[PDB]
Amino acid sequence: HMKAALATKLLSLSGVFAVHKPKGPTSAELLNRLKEKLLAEAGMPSPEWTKRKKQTLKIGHGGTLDSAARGVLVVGIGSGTKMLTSMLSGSKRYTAIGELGKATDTLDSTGKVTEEKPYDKITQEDIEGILQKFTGNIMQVPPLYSAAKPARPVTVYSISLQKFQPPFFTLDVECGGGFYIRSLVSDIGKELSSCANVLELTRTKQGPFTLEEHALPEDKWTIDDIAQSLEH
Ligand SMILES: [Br-]
Ligand SMILES: [Br-]
């Protein structure tokens, strides 16, 4: 089962690439599934079964993506794990769906409802209007259940409203690393004299890696595909 030439190839890879994380798994669980998958392809033993030799695969991610979210997760392999600290400086892009009228303790659709306000007076123009208060250098309080927290300075490069089907508004956001999309959605609901929480959250870009162009689907989580897409 061991394929020695493929094993050499796997352990020779070093750089950064991106994968597509589906909704459901944590970022740690996805890294574990990806690590076990590549080792099994080469026929190498599990990490709990390595002989403490140099033939130990090194892998990690460069910016966490929560369980309920989807999209780009940056992965470092080989000595490329030493590059991941610098990957945090890159800007991010999200597509988020907020739901007016309902607030939750987690600020998304997984938590428990904490508040209900009407939203029938909110028009699409009303939303487009207050988006500029959230564009540029803004103050933002992090979500309570994130790791309350003190307000922190964050950067929003662009926000656009793609769709409004009350109560659901879909936002396209280009922002800095430390920006919280859940905070933005909750505050947009407040600023419109209502409330809101995140129904769906897709990270479409982190740094130089976009979901549209770079993110490897699961069927391409192979030694050869990763080699071809690696950024040394
Ligand atoms: Br930021
Ligand atoms: Br968030």
Swiss-Prot record:
It is found in: Nucleus; Cytoplasm, Cytosol. The active site is at residue 66. Keywords: Acetylation, Cytoplasm, Isomerase, mRNA processing, Nucleus, Phosphoprotein, tRNA processing. GO terms for molecular function: pre-miRNA binding; pseudouridine synthase activity; tRNA pseudouridine(55) synthase activity. Changing residue 92 to E: Abolished RNA-binding and ability to promote processing of let-7 miRNAs. One of its GO terms (cellular component) is nucleus. The keyword Transit peptide does not apply. Highly expressed in heart, skeletal muscle and liver. Expressed at lower levels in lung, small intestine, kidney and spleen. It comes from the Eukaryota. Its EC number is 5.4.99.-, 5.4.99.25. It catalyses: a uridine in mRNA = a pseudouridine in mRNA; a uridine in tRNA = a pseudouridine in tRNA; uridine(55) in tRNA = pseudouridine(55) in tRNA. GO terms for biological process: mRNA processing; mRNA pseudouridine synthesis; positive regulation of pre-miRNA processing; tRNA modification. Its main location: nucleus. Pseudouridine synthase that catalyzes pseudouridylation of mRNAs and tRNAs. Mediates pseudouridylation of mRNAs with the consensus sequence 5'-GUUCNANNC-3', harboring a stem-loop structure. Constitutes the major pseudouridine synthase acting on mRNAs. Also catalyzes pseudouridylation of some tRNAs, including synthesis of pseudouridine(55) from uracil-55, in the psi GC loop of a subset of tRNAs. Promotes the processing of pri-let-7 microRNAs (pri-miRNAs) independently of its RNA pseudouridylate synthase activity. Belongs to the pseudouridine synthase TruB family. This is Pseudouridylate synthase TRUB1. It comes from Homo sapiens. The lineage of its organism: Eukaryota, Metazoa, Chordata, Craniata, Vertebrata. The gene is TRUB1. The chain holds residues 58 to 306 of 349 of the full protein.
